[PDB]
Amino acid sequence: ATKAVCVLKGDGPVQGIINFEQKESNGPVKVWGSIKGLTEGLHGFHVHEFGDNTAGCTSAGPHFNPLSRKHGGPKDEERHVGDLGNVTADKDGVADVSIEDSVISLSGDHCIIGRTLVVHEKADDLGKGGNEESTKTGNAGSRLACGVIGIAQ
Protein backbone atom coordinates (compact mmCIF):
# COMPACT_ATOMS: atom_id res chain seq x y z
CA ALA A 1 0.00 0.00 0.00
CA THR A 2 1.06 3.60 -0.63
CA LYS A 3 0.33 5.74 2.44
CA ALA A 4 0.22 9.46 3.16
CA VAL A 5 -0.38 11.67 6.16
CA CYS A 6 -1.37 15.21 6.92
CA VAL A 7 -1.10 17.23 10.11
CA LEU A 8 -3.67 20.02 10.11
CA LYS A 9 -2.95 23.26 12.00
CA GLY A 10 -4.20 26.87 11.88
CA ASP A 11 -4.25 30.13 13.85
CA GLY A 12 -7.01 28.93 16.21
CA PRO A 13 -7.61 25.63 18.10
CA VAL A 14 -8.42 23.44 15.08
CA GLN A 15 -5.95 20.59 14.74
CA GLY A 16 -5.78 17.01 13.65
CA ILE A 17 -4.13 14.16 11.86
CA ILE A 18 -5.54 12.57 8.69
CA ASN A 19 -4.18 9.34 7.23
CA PHE A 20 -4.45 8.14 3.62
CA GLU A 21 -4.01 4.61 2.27
CA GLN A 22 -4.23 3.22 -1.28
CA LYS A 23 -3.52 -0.51 -1.67
CA GLU A 24 -3.52 -0.36 -5.45
CA SER A 25 -2.57 2.49 -7.76
CA ASN A 26 -5.88 2.04 -9.62
CA GLY A 27 -7.95 1.54 -6.46
CA PRO A 28 -9.68 3.80 -3.96
CA VAL A 29 -7.94 5.86 -1.24
CA LYS A 30 -9.04 5.33 2.37
CA VAL A 31 -9.01 8.57 4.36
CA TRP A 32 -9.23 8.54 8.17
CA GLY A 33 -8.30 10.31 11.32
CA SER A 34 -9.48 12.91 13.72
CA ILE A 35 -9.76 16.71 13.85
CA LYS A 36 -10.45 18.59 17.11
CA GLY A 37 -11.34 22.17 18.07
CA LEU A 38 -14.29 22.41 15.65
CA THR A 39 -17.79 23.82 16.23
CA GLU A 40 -20.43 21.06 16.34
CA GLY A 41 -21.77 20.23 12.86
CA LEU A 42 -20.53 20.09 9.28
CA HIS A 43 -17.21 21.41 8.00
CA GLY A 44 -16.00 21.51 4.41
CA PHE A 45 -13.04 19.26 3.73
CA HIS A 46 -11.01 19.75 0.57
CA VAL A 47 -7.71 19.18 -1.06
CA HIS A 48 -6.50 22.56 -2.36
CA GLU A 49 -4.17 22.76 -5.32
CA PHE A 50 -0.89 24.01 -3.81
CA GLY A 51 1.17 22.71 -0.91
CA ASP A 52 2.17 26.27 -0.07
CA ASN A 53 1.75 27.19 3.59
CA THR A 54 3.90 30.37 3.30
CA ALA A 55 0.71 32.38 4.04
CA GLY A 56 -0.85 29.68 6.24
CA CYS A 57 -3.90 28.17 4.51
CA THR A 58 -4.38 31.27 2.37
CA SER A 59 -1.56 30.40 -0.04
CA ALA A 60 -3.00 26.92 -0.88
CA GLY A 61 -5.00 28.34 -3.79
CA PRO A 62 -8.32 26.92 -5.02
CA HIS A 63 -9.65 23.35 -5.01
CA PHE A 64 -7.44 20.87 -6.79
CA ASN A 65 -9.25 20.72 -10.16
CA PRO A 66 -7.12 19.27 -12.94
CA LEU A 67 -10.19 18.33 -15.08
CA SER A 68 -11.50 21.92 -14.94
CA ARG A 69 -14.93 20.94 -13.58
CA LYS A 70 -17.44 22.73 -11.34
CA HIS A 71 -17.49 22.17 -7.57
CA GLY A 72 -19.52 19.31 -6.16
CA GLY A 73 -19.64 16.65 -3.45
CA PRO A 74 -17.44 13.57 -3.47
CA LYS A 75 -20.18 11.34 -4.96
CA ASP A 76 -21.08 13.72 -7.79
CA GLU A 77 -19.77 13.17 -11.32
CA GLU A 78 -19.25 16.89 -11.71
CA ARG A 79 -16.71 17.70 -8.96
CA HIS A 80 -13.18 18.91 -8.42
CA VAL A 81 -10.70 16.12 -7.71
CA GLY A 82 -10.17 17.96 -4.38
CA ASP A 83 -13.87 17.82 -3.27
CA LEU A 84 -14.11 15.52 -0.23
CA GLY A 85 -17.36 17.02 1.09
CA ASN A 86 -17.94 17.58 4.80
CA VAL A 87 -16.65 16.15 8.05
CA THR A 88 -18.94 16.23 11.11
CA ALA A 89 -17.80 17.49 14.52
CA ASP A 90 -19.70 16.21 17.60
CA LYS A 91 -20.67 18.24 20.71
CA ASP A 92 -17.14 17.84 22.04
CA GLY A 93 -15.79 19.49 18.89
CA VAL A 94 -14.22 16.28 17.55
CA ALA A 95 -14.75 15.15 13.94
CA ASP A 96 -13.91 11.50 13.46
CA VAL A 97 -13.09 11.07 9.79
CA SER A 98 -13.52 7.95 7.71
CA ILE A 99 -13.98 8.31 3.95
CA GLU A 100 -13.27 6.25 0.87
CA ASP A 101 -12.77 8.03 -2.43
CA SER A 102 -11.95 6.84 -5.93
CA VAL A 103 -11.23 10.18 -7.59
CA ILE A 104 -8.24 11.32 -5.47
CA SER A 105 -5.06 9.25 -5.79
CA LEU A 106 -1.71 8.94 -4.01
CA SER A 107 0.01 8.63 -7.41
CA GLY A 108 -0.38 9.76 -11.04
CA ASP A 109 -2.31 12.75 -12.33
CA HIS A 110 -4.84 12.96 -9.49
CA CYS A 111 -2.05 12.65 -6.93
CA ILE A 112 -2.78 14.71 -3.80
CA ILE A 113 0.66 14.24 -2.22
CA GLY A 114 2.35 17.68 -1.83
CA ARG A 115 -1.02 19.45 -2.01
CA THR A 116 -2.94 20.98 0.93
CA LEU A 117 -5.74 19.46 2.95
CA VAL A 118 -8.05 22.11 4.43
CA VAL A 119 -10.88 21.98 7.00
CA HIS A 120 -13.34 24.86 6.79
CA GLU A 121 -15.42 27.11 9.02
CA LYS A 122 -18.81 26.20 7.53
CA ALA A 123 -20.61 23.39 5.72
CA ASP A 124 -19.75 22.74 2.14
CA ASP A 125 -23.10 23.01 0.28
CA LEU A 126 -21.74 20.50 -2.27
CA GLY A 127 -22.28 22.95 -5.13
CA LYS A 128 -26.08 22.91 -4.76
CA GLY A 129 -26.38 26.31 -3.06
CA GLY A 130 -27.63 28.08 -6.18
CA ASN A 131 -25.00 30.84 -6.51
CA GLU A 132 -21.67 31.26 -8.36
CA GLU A 133 -19.72 30.76 -5.13
CA SER A 134 -21.47 27.44 -4.59
CA THR A 135 -19.98 26.16 -7.87
CA LYS A 136 -16.52 27.54 -6.99
CA THR A 137 -16.06 26.70 -3.31
CA GLY A 138 -19.33 25.37 -1.91
CA ASN A 139 -19.63 28.40 0.44
CA ALA A 140 -17.55 26.67 3.14
CA GLY A 141 -16.18 29.95 4.55
CA SER A 142 -12.75 30.45 6.03
CA ARG A 143 -9.91 27.93 6.15
CA LEU A 144 -9.59 27.01 9.84
CA ALA A 145 -6.74 24.53 9.62
CA CYS A 146 -4.57 22.92 6.99
CA GLY A 147 -1.47 20.99 6.15
CA VAL A 148 0.64 19.60 3.34
CA ILE A 149 -0.08 15.94 2.50
CA GLY A 150 3.12 13.93 2.86
CA ILE A 151 4.38 10.46 1.97
CA ALA A 152 4.09 8.15 5.05
CA GLN A 153 5.78 4.87 5.99
Place this chain on the structure above:
Amino acid sequence: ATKAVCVLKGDGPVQGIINFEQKESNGPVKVWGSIKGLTEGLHGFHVHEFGDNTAGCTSAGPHFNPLSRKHGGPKDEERHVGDLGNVTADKDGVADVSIEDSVISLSGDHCIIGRTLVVHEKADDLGKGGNEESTKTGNAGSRLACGVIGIAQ
Protein backbone atom coordinates in the same frame (compact mmCIF):
# COMPACT_ATOMS: atom_id res chain seq x y z
CA ALA B 1 5.99 20.27 -10.92
CA THR B 2 8.26 23.06 -11.96
CA LYS B 3 7.99 24.73 -8.52
CA ALA B 4 7.81 23.61 -4.91
CA VAL B 5 7.99 25.26 -1.50
CA CYS B 6 8.62 24.31 2.10
CA VAL B 7 7.97 26.11 5.36
CA LEU B 8 10.52 25.12 8.03
CA LYS B 9 9.36 25.09 11.66
CA GLY B 10 10.69 23.39 14.82
CA ASP B 11 10.49 23.32 18.61
CA GLY B 12 13.01 26.18 18.97
CA PRO B 13 13.53 29.43 17.08
CA VAL B 14 14.63 28.02 13.71
CA GLN B 15 12.27 29.00 10.88
CA GLY B 16 12.22 29.81 7.21
CA ILE B 17 10.87 29.33 3.72
CA ILE B 18 12.74 27.33 1.08
CA ASN B 19 11.80 27.52 -2.60
CA PHE B 20 12.47 24.88 -5.24
CA GLU B 21 12.48 25.50 -9.02
CA GLN B 22 13.03 23.08 -11.85
CA LYS B 23 12.30 24.52 -15.28
CA GLU B 24 13.17 21.31 -17.12
CA SER B 25 12.36 17.78 -15.90
CA ASN B 26 15.78 16.58 -17.06
CA GLY B 27 17.34 19.45 -15.21
CA PRO B 28 18.88 20.90 -12.06
CA VAL B 29 16.69 22.05 -9.18
CA LYS B 30 17.35 25.54 -7.84
CA VAL B 31 16.93 25.62 -4.02
CA TRP B 32 16.81 29.04 -2.31
CA GLY B 33 15.33 31.02 0.57
CA SER B 34 16.00 32.27 4.08
CA ILE B 35 16.26 30.40 7.39
CA LYS B 36 16.62 32.44 10.60
CA GLY B 37 17.36 31.70 14.25
CA LEU B 38 20.34 29.45 13.48
CA THR B 39 23.74 29.55 15.22
CA GLU B 40 26.47 31.07 13.02
CA GLY B 41 28.18 28.46 10.84
CA LEU B 42 27.41 25.22 9.00
CA HIS B 43 24.14 23.23 9.26
CA GLY B 44 23.22 19.93 7.62
CA PHE B 45 20.44 20.25 5.06
CA HIS B 46 18.72 17.12 3.80
CA VAL B 47 15.60 15.76 2.28
CA HIS B 48 14.30 12.98 4.52
CA GLU B 49 12.15 10.16 3.33
CA PHE B 50 8.67 10.77 4.85
CA GLY B 51 6.42 13.84 4.82
CA ASP B 52 5.25 12.89 8.32
CA ASN B 53 5.25 15.64 10.91
CA THR B 54 3.08 13.67 13.39
CA ALA B 55 5.86 13.52 15.97
CA GLY B 56 7.65 16.68 14.85
CA CYS B 57 10.78 16.24 12.73
CA THR B 58 11.52 12.79 14.21
CA SER B 59 8.85 11.09 12.16
CA ALA B 60 10.45 12.26 8.85
CA GLY B 61 12.55 9.09 8.88
CA PRO B 62 16.08 8.82 7.49
CA HIS B 63 17.57 10.54 4.39
CA PHE B 64 15.71 10.00 1.14
CA ASN B 65 17.78 7.20 -0.33
CA PRO B 66 15.95 5.30 -3.06
CA LEU B 67 19.22 3.93 -4.60
CA SER B 68 20.32 2.57 -1.23
CA ARG B 69 23.66 4.38 -1.19
CA LYS B 70 25.81 5.63 1.68
CA HIS B 71 25.66 9.24 2.88
CA GLY B 72 27.79 11.80 1.09
CA GLY B 73 28.02 15.39 0.06
CA PRO B 74 25.95 16.64 -2.90
CA LYS B 75 29.05 16.65 -5.14
CA ASP B 76 29.66 12.90 -4.60
CA GLU B 77 28.43 10.06 -6.82
CA GLU B 78 28.05 8.03 -3.59
CA ARG B 79 25.32 9.98 -1.83
CA HIS B 80 21.70 9.75 -0.80
CA VAL B 81 19.32 11.50 -3.18
CA GLY B 82 18.40 13.70 -0.18
CA ASP B 83 21.97 14.85 0.58
CA LEU B 84 22.07 18.55 -0.06
CA GLY B 85 25.12 19.11 2.17
CA ASN B 86 25.41 22.19 4.37
CA VAL B 87 23.81 25.65 4.57
CA THR B 88 25.67 28.54 6.28
CA ALA B 89 24.13 30.94 8.77
CA ASP B 90 25.72 34.38 9.18
CA LYS B 91 26.54 36.26 12.41
CA ASP B 92 22.87 37.24 12.72
CA GLY B 93 21.80 33.61 12.49
CA VAL B 94 20.43 33.86 8.93
CA ALA B 95 21.14 31.35 6.14
CA ASP B 96 20.39 32.83 2.72
CA VAL B 97 20.25 29.41 1.07
CA SER B 98 21.34 29.08 -2.56
CA ILE B 99 21.93 25.58 -3.88
CA GLU B 100 21.62 23.94 -7.23
CA ASP B 101 21.32 20.17 -7.37
CA SER B 102 20.86 17.73 -10.24
CA VAL B 103 20.11 14.56 -8.23
CA ILE B 104 16.92 15.72 -6.45
CA SER B 105 13.92 16.27 -8.76
CA LEU B 106 10.40 17.72 -8.61
CA SER B 107 9.15 14.69 -10.62
CA GLY B 108 9.84 10.98 -11.20
CA ASP B 109 11.68 8.49 -8.97
CA HIS B 110 13.81 11.15 -7.23
CA CYS B 111 10.79 13.36 -6.57
CA ILE B 112 11.08 15.20 -3.28
CA ILE B 113 7.50 16.60 -3.23
CA GLY B 114 5.64 15.15 -0.27
CA ARG B 115 8.90 14.50 1.63
CA THR B 116 10.51 16.49 4.43
CA LEU B 117 13.23 19.14 4.28
CA VAL B 118 15.30 19.20 7.46
CA VAL B 119 17.88 21.68 8.73
CA HIS B 120 20.23 20.32 11.41
CA GLU B 121 22.00 21.21 14.60
CA LYS B 122 25.54 20.62 13.38
CA ALA B 123 27.63 20.57 10.23
CA ASP B 124 27.22 17.65 7.84
CA ASP B 125 30.68 15.99 7.56
CA LEU B 126 29.70 14.91 4.01
CA GLY B 127 30.58 11.26 4.64
CA LYS B 128 34.20 12.01 5.54
CA GLY B 129 34.13 11.55 9.36
CA GLY B 130 35.51 8.00 9.53
CA ASN B 131 32.70 6.42 11.52
CA GLU B 132 29.53 4.52 10.71
CA GLU B 133 27.37 7.48 11.65
CA SER B 134 29.18 9.64 8.99
CA THR B 135 27.98 7.20 6.31
CA LYS B 136 24.37 7.46 7.49
CA THR B 137 23.71 11.00 8.60
CA GLY B 138 26.96 12.88 8.22
CA ASN B 139 27.02 13.48 12.06
CA ALA B 140 24.75 16.53 11.60
CA GLY B 141 23.03 16.01 14.97
CA SER B 142 19.50 16.90 15.86
CA ARG B 143 16.70 18.18 13.61
CA LEU B 144 16.18 21.86 14.43
CA ALA B 145 13.37 22.54 11.99
CA CYS B 146 11.53 20.88 9.16
CA GLY B 147 8.59 20.95 6.78
CA VAL B 148 6.82 18.95 4.14
CA ILE B 149 7.81 19.92 0.61
CA GLY B 150 4.70 21.02 -1.31
CA ILE B 151 3.75 21.78 -4.92
CA ALA B 152 3.88 25.56 -5.58
CA GLN B 153 2.98 27.94 -8.43
